[PDB]
Ligand binder design. Structure first.
Ligand code: MG
Ligand code: MG
Length: 226
DNA sequence: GGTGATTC
């Protein structure tokens, strides 16, 4: 849950979530074009404020002033709502990070094989996030985290954890300011997209290096190498 | 107050 792709246009991601009137997001036809989105960068993050959807560039990582460790990039759904650290973000900082799919590295012996995981039906994924509001302030240390869950069914074949991916319906409800922390927990449990909705393939090991940013990084290898 | 890779 530490790398993903966000390569399509804003409209490609927003079309499934709301009518245009519900957005305060300027039209932009340019694909976001990111094939290797890394922790510690600014990522376009979707949230609701002032009764409209907003898209803000937000640091992927969370390190409050009292936190003297490396910024956290994930929050476990099992405990985040009651965590002394994450509870205020669960209540007031919910957001969505949309993506084409995400990468996981399957460990085999002492080496890894990266996989690109995506919805078989072609839809983008809406990953549940929590973060430090107000998002538009461009904070350098207190940004957002991707909520994770235990891997289910086939995804356990790759890694023990997975991002909490919500249906488009659940993703919209997740962002609403009217929805409480407890109601957010209900959405997280009932809205998680099951692993059987995803397919995956091995991709080039070049994706491991965050300096690599070509479109080939999400494509299937021509020959699986061991 | 917690959870990815790098000829690191
Ligand atoms: Mg060994
Ligand atoms: Mg600050």
């Amino acid at each position: 849950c530490g790398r993903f792709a966000q390569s399509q246009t804003r409209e490609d991601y927003l079309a499934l979530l709301a009518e245009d009137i519900e957005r305060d997001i300027p039209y932009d036809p340019e694909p976001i074009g990111r094939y290797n989105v890394a922790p510690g960068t600014k990522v376009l993050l979707l949230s609701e404020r002032d009764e409209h959807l907003h898209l803000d560039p937000v640091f992927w990582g969370y390190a409050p002033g009292w936190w003297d460790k490396p910024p956290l990039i994930n929050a476990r759904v099992e405990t985040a709502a009651t965590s002394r650290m994450f509870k205020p973000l669960w209540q007031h900082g919910r957001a969505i990070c949309f993506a084409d799919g995400w990468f996981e590295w399957k460990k085999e012996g002492d080496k890894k094989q990266p996989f690109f995981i995506y919805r078989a039906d072609g839809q983008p994924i809406f990953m549940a996030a929590i973060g430090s509001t107000p998002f538009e302030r461009g904070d350098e240390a207190e940004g957002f985290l991707i909520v994770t869950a235990a891997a289910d069914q086939g995804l356990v074949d790759i890694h023990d954890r997975r991002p909490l991916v919500l249906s488009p319906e659940a993703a919209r409800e997740w962002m609403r300011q009217e929805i409480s922390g407890k109601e957010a927990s209900e959405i997280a449990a009932s809205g998680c997209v099951p692993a059987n909705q995803f397919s995956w393939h091995p991709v080039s090991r070049a994706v491991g290096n965050v300096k690599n940013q070509g479109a080939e990084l999400i494509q299937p290898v021509l020959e699986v190498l061991f």
